[PDB]
Amino acid sequence: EPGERGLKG
């Protein structure tokens, strides 16, 4: 992701 935080795609 460019500008989000999270888990692996």
Epitope: P2, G3, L7, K8
Partner: antibody, heavy 119, light 109 residues
């Protein structure tokens, strides 16, 4: 790429903790989150939250309602505001540059600033 | 979990190999990072995206992230390796960035 924390070393319980971080030798224009970690004396690291230049902001849920992390790219600064401080908020506070998405790595770190919360 | 589980203490003579664990399979779901802290300095990134080393971090530092336990592996242990090591990873369940409990690595003198 040097991050530097600045602000008061002593804060009074019930008042607001306000820290500032200056960024040198890197534009804040770029695809990075800027954030804050704290560490109580001989306890662990605790992620407070982070912000990107698009205004998106992530927070520790249990502190989310007391926490304000803001950045101004033009000043090369990132701010932290923590309201209603208690004796529990005594910590070293560190500014971090964060790669976002799935990665979530923190590099570099600022030297840190000691904050004592007492009346 | 709100804090990842790490052993509080790991220790070995200079030259030995050591493993530091970080604990459903929610770890396999995110990229694990590892941080070295010596007293009176800020944490330093030592492993990112499970496995990768930033610049200046020699090859005897490596990391794995299988389901249940992400590891930090150090071969050829040196006195200068003596520090607190913290794993870190996103918990999409809590939707927060979580650190581990921290491990003190002692190089036995």
């Amino acid at each position: 790429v040097q991050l530097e924390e600045s602000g008061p070393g002593l804060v009074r319980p019930s008042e607001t903790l306000s820290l500032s971080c200056t960024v040198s030798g890197f534009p804040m224009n770029e695809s990075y989150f800027w954030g804050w970690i704290r560490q109580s004396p001989g306890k662990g690291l605790e992620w407070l939250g982070s912000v990107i230049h698009t205004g998106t902001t992530y927070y520790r849920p249990s502190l989310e309602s007391r926490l304000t992390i803001a950045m101004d790219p033009s000043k090369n600064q990132v701010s932290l505001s923590l309201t209603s401080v208690t004796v529990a908020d005594s910590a070293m506070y560190y500014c971090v540059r964060i790669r976002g998405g799935s990665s979530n790595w923190l590099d570099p770190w600022g030297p840190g600033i000691v904050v004592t919360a007492s009346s | 979990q709100s804090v990842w589980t790490q052993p509080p203490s790991v220790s070995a003579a200079p030259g030995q190999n050591v493993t530091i664990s970080c604990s459903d399979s929610i770890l396999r779901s995110a990229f694990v990072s590892w941080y070295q802290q010596v007293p009176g300095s800020a944490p330093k990134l030592v492993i990112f995206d499970d496995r990768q080393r930033p610049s200046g971090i020699p090859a005897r530092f490596s990391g794995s992230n299988s389901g249940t336990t992400a590891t930090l592996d150090i071969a050829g242990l040196q006195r200068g390796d003596e520090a607190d090591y913290y794993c870190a990873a996103w918990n999409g369940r809590l939707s927060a960035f979580v650190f581990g409990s921290g491990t003190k690595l002692t190089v036995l003198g």
